[PDB]
Amino acid sequence: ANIVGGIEYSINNASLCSVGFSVTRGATKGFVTAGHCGTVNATARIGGAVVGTFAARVFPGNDRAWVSLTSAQTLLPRVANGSSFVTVRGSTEAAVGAAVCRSGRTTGYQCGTITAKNVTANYAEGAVRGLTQGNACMGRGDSGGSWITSAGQAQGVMSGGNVQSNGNNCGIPASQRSSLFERLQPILSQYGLSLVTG
Template sequence: MKHSKPNRSLLPLVVAVAAISCGSAMAADEVSPVLKAAMQRDMGVNAQQMSQYLKTERVSQSQEASAQRQLGAGYAGSWIERKADGSFVFVAATAGAKALAIPGVELRRVRYSLSRLQSSMSQLDSSAQRRVLGISKLYSGVHSWHVDPTSNSVVVTFSPGASEEAIDLVAASGADVATVRFVESADKPSLVATIRGGMLYGFSPGATLGCSVGIPARRSGIAGYATAGHCGSVGTRVYVGNSTLGSFTHSNFPGTDRAYVQVSTAHTVLPEITDHNGGVVPVRGSVEAAIGAAVCRSGYRTGYRCGSITGKNVTVNYQEGTVRGLTQSSACAGKGDSGGAWITPAGQAQGVTSGGNVGADGTNCSLPTSQVRMYFDRLNPILSQYGLTLMTR
């Protein structure tokens, strides 16, 4: 197997674009001013583009299932894409022979179906699960792997000088080499733990370091919040200032990176995310956003930052263990933001911060957006696994 340049496998376009209905789309003036300001700052979205983006986001939510049905076995994924002129479009890809027009959707013909890409992804994951710490080869130079519909490939990232490790990992897994795209990256992901973000919580009275309060939720009628599993194990007590905040009642890491902290009744938990500038962003729901969608995150180290979703179902090979099913984003963060909340412009909570390619200074916010890779564990699986009810306004 040879190490080749990125293979996007995108064939000539098969385009079927229809007018986007905006009757039920959220208007730009319904979006939190805090979110609009953050998107304008971090993503260069002006008022007109914001309105057009929200229409496209609505199309992605209403037409993704339809695209999967109509494209059948040839379905190769979908995403929100930003054009060179700053406008947005919802794209669905197909590896099938035929494709009917889908209202509001741009269709593209590609080489591999999503099921074929997912098969390679599953083989890589299965191979990683079979490895035993201290016995098996752990491929420490390999950062992550995930299905990327925008390039129609399974992207495997690795450190400079570790190309043979990446190749060996793929070969050992039995994954379809033709579907793999190797990407060299100098930025090795690490957990953004041992400090805190969002609303600050620590691990001893008066602590100034810890992890981030994540998404507000209830379990059996008692309030708490979802956060990162690597922040603490079941039974770990946490504090806000000198007061006991609560304790971890559920925690999973590695494999996944999720946890739930039950909060003492002495405190009030609100369905809001702090913007670290005197404002809050209300939580409206937990509808999962598409690849390419705008998303923002809150953490005490770097504040409130926005970017877009750049990958889903990513497996990240942290030094501390492999985590599967993460979502990747270009919204920057730093150590101290672990467990913090991710939310869309429409107030749809997305997940909790896991890790990313933070540098020696503890953040990746000085990197160009194209080089930022942050990962969060998805909220809806956390709610389902732990029997939580999302708190909304």
């Protein structure tokens, strides 16, 4: 498969999440995603084919993971945007107030602005701390997906936020949306991963 931020993958043939970013570690191919998407050794599929397995994860407290891939996977420095993409250029963190977009298999590519940092999400499974908030909407299935500026600076991976009874927060105003991401650089640093850039 072509490994692109925002695309669907399944976990154990049972749940769906979204790719965060293509990464490497030496000769091992991988992608980063959210920790609640899977436990270690769970099987990831794209297009119905096994692509790899979860290598490591932290959830709750943090909400991060990476999936180690078979060598046949094709890593791209890209985040899906409808029928095109944004190229991943780097990982410079954006400030509160700055425009940011996110990508995922339920809501597709959504844009808004960064509205807080250091937010705790009190999920039923446990608190997740240190999250950055934006007002782009999102919904269930989007988790793990890329957050990235239009200039290609990768920000983090979708964690969650104030999903409504319909499974998303697209049906409320942007001023009420809490769409939370796990910052990327601490994920790359804990796991010793290099972000694939173009």
